Amino acid sequence: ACTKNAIAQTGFNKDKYFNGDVWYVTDYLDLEPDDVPKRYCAALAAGTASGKLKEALYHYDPKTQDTFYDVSELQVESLGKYTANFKKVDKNGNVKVAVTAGNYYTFTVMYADDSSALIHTCLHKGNKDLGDLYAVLNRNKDAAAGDKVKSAVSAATLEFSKFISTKENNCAYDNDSLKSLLTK
Ligand code: HEM
Ligand SMILES: NCCc1c[nH]cn1
């Protein structure tokens, strides 16, 4: 299970974060891991679409080739803190698994600027036992974590050297699908 109440960034700028553009996960910290996809690719788009706050997700295991997209309408808990009931979709937004209660992640933006961010997420999916996951994001998929975001990792009482990089995995992303999924 999840154990963290992550604190949102002071003065979080929601319209800048949710500007409809793409964010790439460059490094992550799973608190509840194992033999799991040690190598992983993930990215999201976040924006307001016809007045609704939205996130589109992409996951790719470059070793198994397991691929999936999700789209959610976010609900606000407080500034920088959201609950997302997700639906699994194909890249075009056609529903594969409909929204259901019990399938949701929370999402806290702990730090963000115009190029980088640190988020916490707690995933819930049916009867499964899942733990916290932190992720370092960047607008550039190949960007090394800079001092702003690494300092924020430290400020969250975490150690960046423990985070796992995705940069070795040779991830390629469909940015266009992620942006268009925001409307679906
Ligand atoms: C912004 C970051 C992330 C968020 C919001 C996110 C959220 C989610 C959601 C919503 C699901 C379930 C999707 C579905 O069943 O339709 C999922 C599944 C999963 N995610 Fe992520 N994820 C993120 C990052 C990552 C990272 C970096 C990895 C690698 C450690 C990871 C590995 C997986 C795994 C292996 C699954 C399959 C879970 C299962 O069904 O047991 N995710 N994630
Ligand atoms: N224990 C990490 C579960 C996960 C996958 N995606 C988001 N969270």
From Swiss-Prot:
Binding-site list for heme: H59
Listed under catalytic activity are: 3 nitrite + 2 H(+) = 2 nitric oxide + nitrate + H2O
Which tissues is this protein detected in according to the database? Answer: Salivary gland (at protein level).
Listed cofactors? heme b
Q: What is the effect of changing L130R?
A: Coordination of the heme iron center and inhibition of nitrite disproportionation
Q: Which GO terms describe its biological process?
A: vasodilation
Q: Which GO terms describe its cellular component?
A: extracellular region
The entry's stated outcome for E55Q is: Stabilization of the ferric-NO heme center
Q: What domain of life does the native source organism fall in?
A: Eukaryota
Name the consequence of T121V: No effect on NO-induced conformational change or on pH dependence for NO release. Increased NO association rates
Provide the alphabetized UniProt keywords.
Disulfide bond, Heme, Iron, Metal-binding, Oxidoreductase, Secreted, Signal, Vasoactive, Vasodilator
| Uppermost EC category | oxidoreductase
MF terms from GO for this chain are: histamine binding; metal ion binding; nitric oxide binding; oxidoreductase activity
* Compartments reported by the entry: Secreted
Co-factor note (free text): Binds 1 heme b (iron(II)-protoporphyrin IX) group per subunit.
The record's section on CDD domains has:
lipocalin_NP4 (cd19456)
Q: What InterPro entries does the annotation carry? A: Calycin (IPR012674), Nitrophorin (IPR023613), Nitrophorin_domain (IPR002351)
Described purpose of this protein according to its UniProt entry: Heme-based protein that delivers nitric oxide gas (NO) to the victim while feeding, resulting in vasodilation and inhibition of platelet aggregation. Reversibly binds nitric oxide (NO). Also binds tightly to histamine, which is released by the host to induce wound healing. NO release is pH dependent and linked to loop dynamics.
Miscellaneous note, as given in the UniProt record, is:
Superposition of the structures of NP4 in the presence of ammonia or nitrite shows a conformational change of the protein upon NO(2)(-) binding.
UniProt record similarity statement: Belongs to the calycin superfamily. Nitrophorin family.
Name-wise, this protein is Nitrophorin-4
Q: Which organism is it from?
A: Rhodnius prolixus
Per the UniProt record, the lineage of the source organism begins with:
Eukaryota, Metazoa, Ecdysozoa, Arthropoda, Hexapoda
